[PDB]
Amino acid sequence: APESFDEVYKGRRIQGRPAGYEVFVDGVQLHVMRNADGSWISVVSHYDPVPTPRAAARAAVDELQGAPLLP
Amino acid sequence: TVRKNQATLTADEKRRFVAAVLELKRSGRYDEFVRTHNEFIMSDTDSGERTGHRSPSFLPWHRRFLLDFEQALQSVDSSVTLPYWDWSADRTVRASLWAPDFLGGTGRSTDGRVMDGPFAASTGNWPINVRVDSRTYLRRSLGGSVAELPTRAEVESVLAISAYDLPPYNSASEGFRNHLEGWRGVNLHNRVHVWVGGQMATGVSPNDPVFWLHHAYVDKLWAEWQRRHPDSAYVPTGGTPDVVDLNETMKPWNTVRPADLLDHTAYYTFDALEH
Ligand SMILES: [Cl-]
Ligand SMILES: [Cl-]
Ligand code: NA
């Protein structure tokens, strides 16, 4: 259901698409998870649900402060 | 063995608590815990098998998990007990808990790195090995991501819920558990994790010692609810697929059932309760 994307955000390339959705930040996969009400979270922000996997990707880029995700 | 309010701890008690935890870190026992929690938090789904979170067994599971941790501490110093953090009453950064002689304070703006207390990365006593990103230091941002922590009023609002949990027994559920957990309603448990920041807000939250104090209070809350609703108890009562029923054994132990953890008094008691 969620729409795919691919953009540069704060110097890093965020992008994701349906696999049931996969997200990657600068080539590395950022494990995300969808809740019952369609909201989303990620390994980098697991208790703060956001509307989309794009929002979830941007939350991470922010919190990561330039730090790359581990495989 | 009594779990005291972190606000009531003496300098002595804090010295033995902090020392007990650093040993666990030094021996490698501490990281095992961070690795276990991450396992379930990353595997638990609303649509599928859920044991540690977004499910009725979120409470009994963390109760046993904390039991494991406290016992590991007691194996370093048998006088150390896990203290709770009533974040409702102790809401600011000027709380004993965040003093350099306990957990330390928030992290610096530049990178969110904790700079004081026994768990600062500069002490060499607290490296972050179980990470999600390249950073190896403890990070925090008390009150940075979210306005405030829940209030006494709010907590009472949840404790007031008579239904322990209710189908679909997940993060969309109504009832006590899910509200305590936070996915719905005023939001308690999740927000605290969001309010601390750093690693607490990520899938490797136990990296922050505050994790245990926090969950020791969520644990005390279930106990206070139980007291409020004697006529109400754990559910589902059996047959629920993907969900842990009253008499099923949860992972990773496969030897403990939510029914074996309803009465905490078999393992410990609190300094004081409620109403
Ligand atoms: Cl119960
Ligand atoms: Cl008690
Ligand atoms: Na079941």
Automatic annotation (TrEMBL), chain A:
Cu(2+) 2 binds at residues 31, 46. GO terms for molecular function: copper ion binding. Cu(2+) 5 binds at residue 46. The keyword Metal-binding applies. The keyword Metal-binding applies. Coiled coil: none annotated. Cu(2+) 4 binds at residues 31, 33, 46. Cu(2+) 3 binds at residue 31. Cu(+) 1 binds at residue 31. Cu(2+) 6 binds at residue 47. Keywords: Copper, Metal-binding, Signal. GO terms for biological process: melanin biosynthetic process. Cu(+) 2 binds at residues 31, 33, 46. Transmembrane segments: none annotated. Cu(2+) 1 binds at residue 31. Belongs to the melC1 family. This is MelC. It comes from Streptomyces castaneoglobisporus. The chain holds residues 41 to 122 of 126 of the full protein.
UniProtKB/TrEMBL annotation, chain B:
GO terms for molecular function: metal ion binding; oxidoreductase activity. Cu(2+) 6 binds at residues 189, 193, 215. InterPro entries: Di-copper_centre_dom_sf (IPR008922), Tyrosinase/Hemocyanin (IPR050316), Tyrosinase_Cu-bd (IPR002227). Cu(2+) 2 binds at residues 37, 53, 62. It comes from the Bacteria. The keyword Metal-binding applies. Cu(+) 2 binds at residues 189, 193, 215. This is Tyrosinase. It comes from Streptomyces castaneoglobisporus.
